[PDB]
């Protein structure tokens, strides 16, 4: 063009591209911002959902633990019963031994008595 | 407005946008720490629950072993209890034989 029409058209073409560039810089920034807005929303929901699993698992451990408690009180009563039964067995066995001894010594005496009765009948008879 | 105010509006919109983004980038760092920690915590707790459950099973097996041992002993005790009672009866019959025998010895000795 001629000097003046070229200079005028040049400034207009420059302002259009400068504008177009600012517009795109904004669009891009907005995109990054939007992607983050979405990520932050998703993470907060993820975090709060885990805070509930922690609670829930802690509760299951509480129920598991309480079950151990009952079992342990039960083991206590049972070990007490074993101790007690073993004591009685010893008493029984000991007594049994003692009775068997007395029954045998009585047996030796009936042997001897029947023998002495026979000796006196020998003395008497002849 | 004029072209200059339109550009000024755009620069400010960008500065604002970029600023909001810095807000998010910094707030996110701390947010991920929290999420990773809670994820590891749930794994830790699940491990505890498995170990707790395992202790339950050992106790249950032990409980069974004991109740059985108690039963076996109750029955064995009853046998001993009956065994001693039968002996006591025998011992007693013999004692009465001694009594009778000693009496017969007395009667024969009076004959002499
Ligand atoms: Hg348990
Ligand atoms: Hg006797």
Swiss-Prot record, chain A:
Domain of life: Eukaryota
Localization annotation: Cytoplasm, Myofibril; Cytoplasm, Myofibril, Sarcomere
Disease: Cardiomyopathy, familial hypertrophic, 1: A hereditary heart disorder characterized by ventricular hypertrophy, which is usually asymmetric and often involves the interventricular septum. The symptoms include dyspnea, syncope, collapse, palpitations, and chest pain. They can be readily provoked by exercise. The disorder has inter- and intrafamilial variability ranging from benign to malignant forms with high risk of cardiac failure and sudden cardiac death.
Domain notes: The rodlike tail sequence is highly repetitive, showing cycles of a 28-residue repeat pattern composed of 4 heptapeptides, characteristic for alpha-helical coiled coils.
The family this protein is said to belong to: Belongs to the TRAFAC class myosin-kinesin ATPase superfamily. Myosin family.
Function in brief: Myosins are actin-based motor molecules with ATPase activity essential for muscle contraction. Forms regular bipolar thick filaments that, together with actin thin filaments, constitute the fundamental contractile unit of skeletal and cardiac muscle.
Subunit field text: Muscle myosin is a hexameric protein that consists of 2 heavy chain subunits (MHC), 2 alkali light chain subunits (MLC) and 2 regulatory light chain subunits (MLC-2). Interacts with ECPAS. Interacts (via C-terminus) with LRRC39.
Something else known: The cardiac alpha isoform is a 'fast' ATPase myosin, while the beta isoform is a 'slow' ATPase.
Protein name, per record: Myosin-7
Naturally occurring in which organism (per UniProt): Homo sapiens (Human)
Gene: MYH7
Covered range of the whole protein: 838 to 963 of 1935
UniProtKB/Swiss-Prot annotation, chain B:
Localization: Cytoplasm, Myofibril; Cytoplasm, Myofibril, Sarcomere
Disease field: Cardiomyopathy, familial hypertrophic, 1: A hereditary heart disorder characterized by ventricular hypertrophy, which is usually asymmetric and often involves the interventricular septum. The symptoms include dyspnea, syncope, collapse, palpitations, and chest pain. They can be readily provoked by exercise. The disorder has inter- and intrafamilial variability ranging from benign to malignant forms with high risk of cardiac failure and sudden cardiac death. Congenital myopathy 7A, myosin storage, autosomal dominant: A skeletal muscle disorder characterized by prominent axial and proximal weakening, spinal stiffness, severe scoliosis, with or without respiratory and cardiac involvement. The age at symptom onset can range from early childhood to late adulthood, and disease severity ranges from asymptomatic to severe muscular weakness and respiratory insufficiency. Histopathological examination shows variable findings including subsarcolemmal hyaline bodies in type 1 fibers.
Role description: Myosins are actin-based motor molecules with ATPase activity essential for muscle contraction. Forms regular bipolar thick filaments that, together with actin thin filaments, constitute the fundamental contractile unit of skeletal and cardiac muscle.
Oligomer and partners: Muscle myosin is a hexameric protein that consists of 2 heavy chain subunits (MHC), 2 alkali light chain subunits (MLC) and 2 regulatory light chain subunits (MLC-2). Interacts with ECPAS. Interacts (via C-terminus) with LRRC39.
More about this protein: The cardiac alpha isoform is a 'fast' ATPase myosin, while the beta isoform is a 'slow' ATPase.
Domain characteristics, as noted in the entry: The rodlike tail sequence is highly repetitive, showing cycles of a 28-residue repeat pattern composed of 4 heptapeptides, characteristic for alpha-helical coiled coils. Limited proteolysis of myosin heavy chain produces 1 light meromyosin (LMM) and 1 heavy meromyosin (HMM). HMM can be further cleaved into 2 globular subfragments (S1) and 1 rod-shaped subfragment (S2).
Family: Belongs to the TRAFAC class myosin-kinesin ATPase superfamily. Myosin family.
Annotated protein name in UniProt: Myosin-7
Organism name: Homo sapiens (Human)
Gene: MYH7
Boundaries of the shown chain within the full protein: 850 to 961 of 1935
